[PDB]
């Protein structure tokens, strides 16, 4: 689990969005595994606007932060799960690092701010849903 809180927006993995997120829906994209909802209180986070390919992410299954080298946002095949059919997920960045299904929502950050959140993984890989292109979050 995990969310980004920026301005009057809450960014979460679409497959983990609550009844409340859907009732205050601003934008969602099944192909990116992202959902944005509106909030009344002002958020604590700031978004990176950069081309960084190194950063640090929080891994809840280890209660630890790990440094990562990650690929540019791209279209990657993701096997069927209990939440989605087999499909291509867009705006996804892969990296070598530990992740388990419940790690989704962990924030990836560079020196410029929030880059994205954990969305995929398996076998020593961790994938992050990019949010740096969503300029309207600011
Ligand atoms: C953090 O994700 C994982 C970690 C370890 C193992 C497996 C995973 C993920 N499976 C894959 C095929 O990437 C996973 O559990 N997902 C279920 C929820 C939706 C996710 C998505 N489609 O973006 C996929
Ligand atoms: Zn950066």
Ligand 1 contact via 119 beta carbon (within 6 Å)? yes
Query: Coil, strand, or helix at residue 56?
Result: strand
What residues does each domain of the chain span? 3-44, 45-138
Ligand 1 contact via 99 beta carbon (within 6 Å)? yes
Elucidation method: X-ray
Q: Is 79 exposed, middle or buried (0-12, 13-18, 19+ CB in 10 A)?
A: exposed
110 has binding-site annotation: yes
The CA distances from residue 3 to 67, 113, 119, in Å, are 19, 14, 12
Q: Which of the ligands is closest to the CA of residue 104? A: 1
**Which sign does the torsion angle of CA 122, 127, 7, 21 carry?**
negative
107 CA from centroid of ligand 1 (Å): 15
User: CA-to-CA distance for 136 and 98, rounded, in angstroms?
Assistant: 31
Residues 6+ apart with CB under 8 A from 110: 48, 50, 52, 54, 55, 56
């Amino acid at each position: 689990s995990g969310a980004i809180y920026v301005g009057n927006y809450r960014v979460v993995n679409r497959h983990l969005a609550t009844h409340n997120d859907w009732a205050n829906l601003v934008w969602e994209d099944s192909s990116r595994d992202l959902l944005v909802s509106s909030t009344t209180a002002q958020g604590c986070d700031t978004i990176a606007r950069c081309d960084c390919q190194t950063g640090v992410y929080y891994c809840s299954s280890r209660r630890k932060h790990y440094p990562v080298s990650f690929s540019k946002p791209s279209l990657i095949f993701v096997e069927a799960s209990e939440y989605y059919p087999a499909r291509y997920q867009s705006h996804l960045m892969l990296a070598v690092g530990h992740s388990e299904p419940g790690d989704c929502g962990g924030i990836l950050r560079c020196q410029h701010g929030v880059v994205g959140i954990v969305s995929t993984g398996g076998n020593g890989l961790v994938g992050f849903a990019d949010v740096r292109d969503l300029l309207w979050l600011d």
